[PDB]
């Protein structure tokens, strides 16, 4: 019981098969488990690199509203974030999308438009003539 997952740029990551058993690798072994194994060949992941795959197995190892461990684990750069979102969507880790999409929503929540726009470097693709009609359309608080 050891999948030999290889990262995008190339680094072999042996895991026990309950640690990396998520609905796109769990499903693969269910539909390709009838025949003989391929001598424990590496299963490359072309959309997950070797610095993000390290954290994905760190999060799945422990778990064999945003608790304390998940608050201190998700204390990475915004660039190290936004790729844990994509690497949990790619491999379909249903419990890592939840605790990560709350965090990105926890810095949108209760911060007014201006510093929300500043936090995520959003360029204001918004004029002022049509701002008077969008603030009157949501008048009902």
């Amino acid at each position: 019981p050891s999948i030999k997952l290889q990262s995008s740029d190339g680094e072999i990551f042996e895991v026990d098969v309950e640690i990396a058993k998520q609905s796109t690798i769990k499903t693969m072994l269910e539909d390709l488990g009838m025949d003989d194994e391929g001598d424990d060949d590496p299963v490359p992941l072309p959309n997950v690199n070797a610095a993000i795959l390290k954290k994905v197995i760190q999060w799945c190892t422990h778990h064999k509203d945003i608790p304390v461990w998940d608050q201190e684990f998700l204390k990475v750069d915004q660039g190290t974030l936004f790729e844990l979102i994509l690497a949990a969507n790619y491999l379909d880790i249903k419990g890592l999308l939840d605790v990560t999409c709350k965090t990105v929503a926890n810095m949108i929540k209760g911060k007014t438009p201006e510093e929300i726009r500043k936090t995520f470097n959003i360029k204001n693709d918004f004029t002022e003539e049509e701002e008077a009609q969008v603030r009157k359309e949501n008048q009902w608080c």
Binding site: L86, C101, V104, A105, I108, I116, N124, N138
Partner: protein, 372 residues
Amino acid sequence: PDINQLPPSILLKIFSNLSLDERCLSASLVCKYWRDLCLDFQFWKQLDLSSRQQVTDELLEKIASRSQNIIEINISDCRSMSDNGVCVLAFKCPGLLRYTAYRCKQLSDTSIIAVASHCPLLQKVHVGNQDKLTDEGLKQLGSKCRELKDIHFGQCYKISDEGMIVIAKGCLKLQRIYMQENKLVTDQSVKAFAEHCPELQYVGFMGCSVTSKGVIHLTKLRNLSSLDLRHITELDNETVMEIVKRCKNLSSLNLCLNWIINDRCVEVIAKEGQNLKELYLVSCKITDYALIAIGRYSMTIETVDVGWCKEITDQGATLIAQSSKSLRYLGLMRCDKVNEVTVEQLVQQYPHITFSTVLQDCKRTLERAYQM
């Protein structure tokens, strides 16, 4: 690091973690793309506009103008719109499922007529304390949309006799029932409606005038789960015995405030009751004698409720405190016949009990209110 490079599925999953106020007030002014994301059938098929007072009067024209799949309208505690403002939305109502409007007094039977004929699909009609809701509209509600599966008609003193029979002959898919102090409810409307659908699980007839002549015939069905027969008119004891002996599947039994009901029922309820989970006996005239049987002869129990008991045995309560393994639900209130040892020792002896005494639940409530 660009957040807008994320696929729209991820952005919608992020935006679903914001309230409607946050989504329509802050995240809709950041840019064009966020405003277009925070406007979907995803976010506008579960309305829940309860207690929005004098802000939604004619606005209901825009919430359902291009929206096609409203299924969770909830305008409870409304005080602003009128019959016109609800019938305009009722005209379309594509596949509405769970219409709910409690305590909306200004609404009348016209809203019921509008909502009952323009959607042949429904699942929940939980209306509330709306007065002047006469029975003429519920007739057509049962005649046209015979797909409804759950009603709630408390505190509507105009549903005397025609309503139950009319949504009892046509409709058959009902699962739950709830009624309140509604007078002029005759017995000759439920006896006929007791053989068609035996799949009912929740039954509630508090403060109603249902005679036991229909309760006696309840032995037919053997799939009932929950009972709420509070303040009922002398239900048969042997019927309760038969339904508790045969129907092993039984979840709840309240039977509170009943005075002709005697001590025999609770004496015998511990003889064979193993799956019973809670008991609500408030102001019962128990003769402090069934405690020994309920402690010795009962091993599976986790919820116990002692009400306005004038007399009690402190020794027996202490014995049953350690007799069980997980029965820690002593919500004592106004128990004058109590000592000062249990409330002083069992608080620290068992750190897994919350208790309900006045001396304790005054600092705890303030502390939990201050923290949250």
